[PDB]
């Protein structure tokens, strides 16, 4: 039943691509642009002119848009806009674009970026983390969109481009924990995540990764550490010199600002990478 919708989306996208591009357009990569990476749009070449499809006109895409064009010589699709389970969408609805795009038969790489809170005590706002594993906490309970998910060669390629491009920004390697949201973590929650083996935490991405793997794609995933998760116990009522409980708290404003500051380095890394998938 949900397959007719997947085929309708494919058919609509297929025919728009035929009408738009002189030559056959077969994207090799899907880039999902998380928080702050929307401007990767500007890396798409003006010739041949891009195709931009609003989600509102693609069957099943529950705003956001798809951008088909050439980036650094490579035909790609950009997802500018992502769907998150805390919005009230089912995980199937969240990964519907991947399954639709998979019917083009040409994508074999998912490059996904997100913002994330730093759980590892050595991470700092402004670092990046190349994801090499994950913990799917909602999946623990059976929320699923449908064995090493994070392709080693693509991770090596990412670090080789950091070097080639002389980007000084730190890129850690570690485990991303997917939690539902939309709250930021309590102190005890973040300490729990740390002891669980979490390096960075966010509210997206993992269902996309799992679906991409199920379609046979390779996956490169990159988190922008936008904030350092508060882990210290809160001020005690017996403290005569307490740290105010509001100090250091996470805000969406901080997430937007720091993802935008890291955006240019991330855009340059992805631009270099896509030419060599």
């Amino acid at each position: 039943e949900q397959r007719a919708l997947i085929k309708s989306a494919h058919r609509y996208i297929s025919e728009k691509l035929e009408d738009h591009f002189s030559s056959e357009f077969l994207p090799k990569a899907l880039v999902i642009c998380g928080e702050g990476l929307s401007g990767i749009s500007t890396k798409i070449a003006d010739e041949p002119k891009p195709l931009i499809l609003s989600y509102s006109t693609i069957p099943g895409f529950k705003s956001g848009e798809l951008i088909f064009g050439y980036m650094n010589g490579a035909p790609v699709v950009l997802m500018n806009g992502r769907l998150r389970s805390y919005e009230g969408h089912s995980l199937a609805e969240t990964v519907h674009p991947i399954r639709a795009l998979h019917l083009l038969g040409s994508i074999n790489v998912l490059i996904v970026t997100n913002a994330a809170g730093g759980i590892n005590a050595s991470f700092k706002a402004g670092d990046l983390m190349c994801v090499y594993d994950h913990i799917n906490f909602p999946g623990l309970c059976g929320f699923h969109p449908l064995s090493d998910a994070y392709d080693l060669e693509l991770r090596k390629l990412l670090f080789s481009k950091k070097k080639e491009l002389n980007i000084e920004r730190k890129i850690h390697e570690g485990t991303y924990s997917y939690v539902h949201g939309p709250t930021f973590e309590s102190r005890a929650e973040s300490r729990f995540l740390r002891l669980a083996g979490t390096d960075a935490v966010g509210m997206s991405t993992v269902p996309e990764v799992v679906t991409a793997r199920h379609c046979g794609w390779r996956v490169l995933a990159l988190s922008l550490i936008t904030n350092e998760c508060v882990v210290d116990p809160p001020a005690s009522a017996h403290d005569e010199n307490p740290v105010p409980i509001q100090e250091g708290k996470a805000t969406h404003e901080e997430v937007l600002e720091n993802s935008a500051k890291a955006s240019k380095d991330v855009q340059e890394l992805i631009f270099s990478v896509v030419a060599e998938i």
Copy 2:
């Protein structure tokens, strides 16, 4: 659907606002919602006879659900406690009954539209996970663990009520320091000897009491007390902008030791120490008067 939810919150507020205006000769503007936990219905005896209070059964308020337990249907009580106008939630909806989390926290949204409440005082009963806690101690909650929320059972799931609060809510500042200081000040003023710890409350769905491994898991995760309520209400109150004071009564000590091995010469019987509802109730009843007096003092100073 958010519009169905708005219409039904709007509707409950009209009913309540109209009943208040019809019943009280001066405008009734409560400063706190007090949610009475298990065994703590006695808090309602601190509502003064004059001015006469208003009791609204959940049965009659649009959008309110009735608890599955009989005959505890649940009611809001609007009155004066220690001269301060309050609203009491006598009874609560707990999610293990079959209610969605949105249904359990709908009363908070509806009451928020009166435009006067800025404090949630929430009480509960809880199992002791921290080894130093004993049945009969209180725990002032200063942090929590929302493991169901992490895993997809979250009261803010869905479209955001942008007229109430932010899409993305921090919870590292959930438990107001000055209210916890005020609680301890009233324990002092009242010469209450019962312990009041500070620690971390974890919400689990229930209705089973924890297995040993589950309790050990909650402990290593940082839990000091465990219950089946409260965190969704705190989160929603925080979303509305309220300050929160939360107070657990430790009604039982969770069983964390590994069960007897098939290899144990004198085995501890696996049923020794098991939680029961009746233990929880009778220990709540023992501590109710202290909890009642603490809240009665607090409300005159918020």
Copy 3:
């Protein structure tokens, strides 16, 4: 909902109790329900011979959805199988008034570093992860006629049943390793990540799978005793991935263990 679930449980019992009374010359009052997990449906062959057994397809039983097999096993009358509806069968069979033991077997991944593929783990505790979050067989209105609203699970795995299992393993001279440990119920996949297996271990998991616990909880809610046994089919890896900078022997053994245990209850 509760009232329609009650009615379906009653219809399933009514159907089963009739088909039993028509098929067996004498009353069949099973003492045990044996749930045969993934790879262990060979207990179906160990059932006695005389009186020649009763098989009901799930398709035929009101409200179900596999088959229910009623017959004698090593001399004992038993019933074999192979969320609130996942446990519908246990409640229906409870209404016969004779079962007081669930024997549940499963295949599970090894999380305890000491466990090796092919080992057995007798379950003496569990972690019900979905049940902590909101997927729980007892969610909803309580079945007051079956058991309590708030059920303790610190006593869920009977010690005598476990002592009994360990005796039968010696008696049959089974060399297979058998541990005692904690079973974690998850709704994930056998595509668990390394980081997830790492998390399960440090959370206290000895073996992980996707079955058993909802049945254990429902049977305990009915007052039954529970024996649960896992077959470790594989050793989950917990090591992190590479850095960018750098068998029917088991089932046969479980049959004989169950066959032998079924007698002493």
